[PDB]
Write a protein that binds this DNA or RNA. Structure first.
Lengths: 48, 182, 53, 134
RNA sequence: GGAUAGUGGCCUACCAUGGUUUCAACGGGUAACGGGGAAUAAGGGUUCGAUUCCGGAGAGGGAGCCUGAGAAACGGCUACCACAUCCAAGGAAGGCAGCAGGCGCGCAAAUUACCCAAUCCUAAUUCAGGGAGGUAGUGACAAUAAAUAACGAUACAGGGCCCAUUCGGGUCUUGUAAUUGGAAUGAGUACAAUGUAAAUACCUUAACGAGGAACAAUUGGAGGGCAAGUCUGGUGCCAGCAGCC
């Protein structure tokens, strides 16, 4: 799907792990539902 | 829109793709015959898997039945003419145990090697693909020709291609023109 | 901390220029001569990529 | 030298089209592509016919070279050649001249244009002039 | 009886009360056109089939109808609904789910190219016409074949053997070497001819085109599953990786 990014997000990892998962909340062009997508490498939140 | 032109694929990727024994075996019988990749072996393995299903198809049913007799003899004839079976193994039970190795021993590069004037089979593959080895009034650039037991005697170097007689170089003409000034 | 720190930090040592690997058939000539001919001495199973053993 | 040797195999005699239909089988050795002009020249001798009365096409030098395989038509006369040979072949041989007519998109444009003007649009060309004074 | 080319509740009038159904009628859904087939492959199956052939349907949505052997036709007409044009404000013209191309919609798809030369079709018809259809362009959807190197000489090693008189003479072979030297070919490039309707591309070929820095092969991985490091530098529950643990 395609979308326009609303916010940058720092999602906290589940309990055995500990980190900030550098997600992005994005509204879908297709239908208009707002989903939260993960940015898939090290310093890519700064790229999006 | 006219009509669907039929294509089919000749190779098949093995089921479990990381296995010490299979990897060992395949690299060995790739290093022997000087092959490029593992799909060469996957193809020969697919061809043998087609023959073996065609063999079991003709075997399981009645004996002395025209279907078994005709298709069985056609396959055996085709294989003994390739050279994968010999004179004394035309029973349609020898064919079922046929060892992909046997097919790989009948590629053009292997025959160029084993008929001399080839010096290590990696020279025989590069010879063929460089438009040198002509079977007879007919060049072959394919190092997977499957020699057919009657071109074994006639196979040689081309009328062209030095190794032949007609062409004297492309690099020799260079060296001639460079050393011409002395 | 913030995104891309440890990549922005890491001292990027560059790649060294070498002779290439001979591609296609010649690579299988190398992999054959380096495993089934001139293999490193076997203790139990062969060690394909040991450091200073 | 080369000494190119031609062989006209698979001959069918055709008194309907006034033809000798055959497969031309050329050997090239030490050259290639023997020039269809030269092929017609040296095929004129094998059937003692005029070189404007013989036609060859589709030679396709074989893989590895040293050999070509074309299809060759010999006619009884040049008048018959022109009656039965397609105009494109006749221009390849240089006897008939190619009619240099308008591009097919211009031809289709102007036939769609002439669909509109009813008959000889002279009495309409006698309005377009006499309506310019209004 | 009417109508139809004709059979028929097809329609009309007059009669009877019938007909379908737990063997699933009827109603609802289908991101359902059916089939020939397709993918997977012990056998049995499961999933799919808008799409090269056959059949059915529709030409923005319904309905109507003329002409004709044939149509309820839409590159025919008429009306209404939707949307839309040009207008000199009185009027006029619309129907790409044909080809190409543009919007839009999107995760998602090409050139507003050339030609009737082949395949055929139509016509008063050997000639005319055909965006049917072919040809080239875009094109890593798939599919086939298979380049990216081969060969010796020179210095080191090792491995079968004569006696292991410590000898090693190494008399054969498996390699390692930034040492080395000639032969090979297309990848390109281009007279030519071939190809073609004309061309391009292939096929074949004059002349040129290989030396490590090149004519340079990547992509994903190295704890396990799973082939492959308990090797260096950095980070220090962060940054991150991690289909699963």
């Amino acid at each position: 799907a395609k979308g326009i990014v609303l916010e940058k997000l720092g999602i906290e990892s589940k309990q055995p792990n500990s980190a900030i998962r550098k997600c992005v909340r994005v509204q879908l062009i297709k239908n208009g539902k707002k989903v939260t997508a993960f940015v898939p490498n090290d310093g890519c939140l700064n790229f999006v | 829109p006219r009509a669907p032109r039929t294509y089919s694929k000749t190779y098949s990727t093995p089921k479990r793709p990381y296995e010490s024994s299979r990897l060992d075996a395949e690299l060995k019988l790739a290093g022997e015959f000087g092959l490029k990749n593992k799909r060469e072996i996957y193809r020969i393995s697919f061809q043998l898997s087609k023959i073996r299903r065609a063999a079991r198809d003709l075997l399981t049913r009645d004996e002395k039945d025209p279907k078994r007799l005709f298709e069985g003899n056609a396959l055996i004839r085709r294989l003994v003419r390739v050279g994968v079976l010999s004179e004394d193994k035309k029973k349609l039970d020898y064919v079922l145990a046929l060892k992909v190795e046997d097919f790989l021993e009948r590629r053009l590069q292997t025959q160029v090697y084993k008929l001399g004037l080839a010096k290590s089979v990696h020279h025989a593959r590069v010879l063929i693909t460089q438009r040198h080895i002509a079977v007879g009034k007919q060049i072959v650039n394919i190092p997977s020709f499957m020699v057919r037991l009657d071109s074994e005697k006639h196979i040689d170097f081309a009328p062209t291609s030095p190794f032949g007689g007609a062409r004297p170089g492309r690099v020799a003409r260079r060296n001639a023109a460079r050393k011409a000034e002395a | 901390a913030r995104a891309g720190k440890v990549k922005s930090q890491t001292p990027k040592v560059e790649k060294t220029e070498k002779p290439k690997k001979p591609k296609g058939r010649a690579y299988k000539r190398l992999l054959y001569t380096r495993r089934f001919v001139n293999v490193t001495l076997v203790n139990g199973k062969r060690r394909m990529n040991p450091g200073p053993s | 030298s080369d000494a190119v040797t031609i062989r006209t195999r698979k001959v069918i005699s055709n008194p309907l089209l006034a033809r000798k239909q055959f497969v031309v089988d050329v050997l090239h050795p030490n050259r290639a592509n023997v020039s269809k002009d030269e092929l017609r020249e040296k095929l004129a001798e094998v059937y003692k016919a005029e070189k404007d009365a013989v036609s060859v096409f589709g030679f396709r030098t074989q893989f590895g070279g040293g050999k070509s395989v074309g299809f060759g038509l010999v006619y009884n006369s040049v008048a018959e050649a022109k009656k039965f040979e397609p105009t494109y072949r006749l221009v390849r041989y240089g006897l008939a001249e190619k009619v240099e007519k308008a591009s097919r998109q211009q031809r289709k444009q102007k036939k769609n244009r002439d669909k509109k003007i009813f008959g000889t649009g002279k009495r309409l060309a006698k309005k377009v002039a006499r309506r310019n004074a209004d």
